[PDB]
Amino acid sequence: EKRTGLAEDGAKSVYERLKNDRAPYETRAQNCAQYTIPSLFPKDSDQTPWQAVGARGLNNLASKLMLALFPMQTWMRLTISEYEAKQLLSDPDGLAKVDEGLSMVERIIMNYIESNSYRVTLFEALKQLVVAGNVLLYLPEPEGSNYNPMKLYRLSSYVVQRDAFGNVLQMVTRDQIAFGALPEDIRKAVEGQGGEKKADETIDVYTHIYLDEDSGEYLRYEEVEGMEVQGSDGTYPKEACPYIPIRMVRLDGESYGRSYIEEYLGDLRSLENLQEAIVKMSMISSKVIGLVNPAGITQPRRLTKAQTGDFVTGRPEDISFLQLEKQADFTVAKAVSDAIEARLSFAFMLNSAVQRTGERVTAEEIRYVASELEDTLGGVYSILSQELQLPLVRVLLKQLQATQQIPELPKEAVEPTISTGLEAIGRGQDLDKLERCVTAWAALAPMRDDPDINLAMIKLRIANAIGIDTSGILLTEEQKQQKMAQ
Amino acid sequence: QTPWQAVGARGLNNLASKLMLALFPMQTWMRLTISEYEAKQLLSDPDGLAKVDEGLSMVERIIMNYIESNSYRVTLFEALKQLVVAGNVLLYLPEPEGSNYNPMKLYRLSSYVVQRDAFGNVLQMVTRDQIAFGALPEDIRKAVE
Amino acid sequence: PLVRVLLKQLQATQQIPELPKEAVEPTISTGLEAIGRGQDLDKLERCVTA
Amino acid sequence: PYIPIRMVRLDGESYGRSYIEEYLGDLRSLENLQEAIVKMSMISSKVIGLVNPAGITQPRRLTKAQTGDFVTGRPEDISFLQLEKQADFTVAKAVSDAIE
Amino acid sequence: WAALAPMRDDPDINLAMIKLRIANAIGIDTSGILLTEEQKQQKMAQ
Amino acid sequence: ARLSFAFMLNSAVQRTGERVTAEEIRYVASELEDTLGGVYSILSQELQL
Amino acid sequence: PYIPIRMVRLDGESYGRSYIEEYLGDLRSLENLQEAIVKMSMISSKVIGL
């Protein structure tokens, strides 16, 4: 069947069209990668760098973020939905069974992420997210309990179109598979479409995903050499598309995202250009060249051949050694280079932005400057929890629930709330409030045996101000007199 | 074109980061409490009161759950940057509409306009989107040709 | 303004289960009050130390 | 549902002022200077030989020499072009730094 | 839990609930952390 | 020096510039731990499992 | 039982990148410089009478 809508005139033809507005982004990504790690986004179409600062910064930033966002620890938290949680009012037996299945679900997701090598690709994705605007993550249908890894498309080989509100209208990926590696059906279709193909010839395979105007849901198909692939068609519901295009830095009303490094590219290239001319300098400067005056007696052969300790026919007025003596010029260059590199280290939260060789670095300023690095990391992290973490989890839930790898739970826990960050680590806001109230209560120990002060009321008021539940914090009359008797 | 120095870049970035962690943290950040007038009514009625405070600090957690689930933090960040560099930002939050992914919309100063009265209340606004024809809704698309 | 609006939008779509009149127009604290490190707590535990 | 926000108010006016605007002077000053400084560092780090063509020392023979090599020439013919704007720099640096 | 030693002999504070709540926020199993009624009164007797 | 950070050589701490404090040693050492945790958490997925 | 391992993945590619590659520029630089310096030290240690 000929399909229409956004897929009216072929997948490849859409890819081609949308590529036009994507181009700036991939130029920008190519420039940033040039001065860090070029293999992330090479300057092929529309060699290593001199300095390694870009390289170790990017590597650092990714590592840090990946150990924050996706640690070996449990990192999401599923909890009962607010509405259904109001239902199980005065039903602890029926509740605590919900939370048991939810925290089971937690563990299943975790076991999946562990066993399908999600961490490794997430790393590569973070690098990409940092250097270029965007990554496209694709997680296929679980399909058994097999090794189901994730797939990553770097900005160069995929394309996106968003509406007014930033919702995804259509996507087109473009794999480049060698003919030999293609499935037989596809392989046969291709050569049956004319011209016999060599095993090492590469074949563009376009994958089109798009919103249908009629259905409130996505359609997908694969498309090779202008013809749709046999049984490559499919559909995805709007709220759970397994293709996730991620932006690092949003500009609303725009299909792709800006990148992190781009903001600090000015100072990065500046460093690169300088570090080059300095290294070259040092090379001229470490080269010894003698100068025998040919008007003199001292003959150069006789010098080169000499053993150490040797007396040789000559005068010292004939030989001189070519001195560079660009000694001051160097320290000006160095001072600048150093300044910039220092500025970059802060932007890559390298811990050795503390390392200043100027003065005796106190201990007290270290804590303050290290908390400027924590400040700016909290920034990217709290943005990448929304952008990368929550969508990845939300989609994994729906995917696993579809294949009944998630044993049936009671209605309450089908749409739970997904906590991430410090809550899940078990170091959250609730615990803090509780153990700040305990420390506030211990400060009325020097009046425990009160004359007429009434500890009960003050005890409850402290908890209220701080904001603990205080649902069964105070001992009731019947339970207190019961405990007074025993 | 990029700038020669990155002091401004890290400066703005710092400022926004700090502000956004202060204004919109993962913690609860608003607090809803009984109105002064109606609170005077429930004088000597604790049982009837702390039920109000119970439904309110429910409301808190609902708003919070929405802000978490609808990516409010990420757009607030971009808005704070905008707010610092250009004088003003425009936030648009559409009708919840089911229980779906309803994000917020941001209009930079360049693509919206405002007129205020004497007392500074809003009289009119006019935003200006710039959509590719292909992305438009079919009804509009067909009107346009 | 952000909060005030959300309240009115959520109460419109009855994504906010009905509460008794008192809590339809409440007062919206922000800042330190909410964090649980406010003026009230300070005054209390300054009175305990006195 | 449309909320137009201002950063810094000026009463009786539809739009708001910005935070950075207040400090723009010192910011553009910085940007002008750090430019002129960066460019300085590129001049200063560039080696350029000067072989006196009245002389004996021929430049082809200097560029082709290995390290350790002895070569026909006199050190009155080669000189390396020095920028020595060492003091002028630290003036510019002092000011840049003060602003930063 | 060692931080509520300066109020172990509580007047009307209820250690039981706060002890379980701390464990929940941290996120231990709490599957048989509290002493049950029959097992507690058994231990009080012995 | 730069390469020593990249190879997590402990003696990237060793700077002859200044009297190296005790408090910065810890902080710079944990840059090396940071970047080691990086390669390790990858190679655990790539090589170990 | 054949396990081919990659260090640094590039999705859609059969072989992996290396860890050192990312820092090779600074490494060859050192090698070149250290060579010219060691060679300097042999010229500097050599006594020749005239």
Numbering used by the authors:
A (entry chain B): 3 to 48, 55 to 494
B (entry chain A): 55 to 199
C (entry chain A): 399 to 448
D (entry chain A): 250 to 349
E (entry chain C): 449 to 494
F (entry chain C): 350 to 398
G (entry chain C): 250 to 299
Task: Give passages from the manuscript.
Several X-ray data sets from various crystal forms of the T7 portal in its dodecameric (12mer) and tridecameric (13mer) forms were collected. Although the portal protein is always found as a dodecamer in virions, assemblies containing 11–13 subunits have been described for other portals when expressed under non-physiological conditions. The T7 portal structure was finally solved by combining cryo-EM and X-ray crystallography. An initial map of the tridecameric form of the gp8 protein at 5.8 Å resolution was obtained by cryo-EM (gp8-13merEM). The ring-shaped volume allowed the ab-initio building of a partial poly-alanine model composed mainly of α-helices, which contained 36% of the structure. This partial model was later used for phasing a 3.4 Å resolution gp8-13mer crystallographic data set by molecular replacement and a full atomic model was built into the resulting electron density map (gp8-13mercryst). A deep cleft separates the wing and crown domains, which are connected only by a hinge at G434 between strand β13 of the wing and helix α11 of the crown. This feature confers some freedom of movement to the crown domain around that point, which is also supported by the fact that monomers from the dodecameric and tridecameric structures are very similar, except for the relative position of the crown domain respect to the rest of the protein (root mean squared deviation (RMSD) 0.849 Å).
Phage portal proteins are key viral components located in a single pentameric vertex of the capsid and they act as initiators of capsid assembly. They are also critical components of the DNA-packaging complex and are involved in tail assembly. Here we report a number of crystal and high-resolution cryo-electron microscopy (cryo-EM) structures of the T7 bacteriophage portal (gp8). The structures show two conformations—open and closed—of the portal and suggest a possible mechanism of the channel valve that regulates DNA passage.
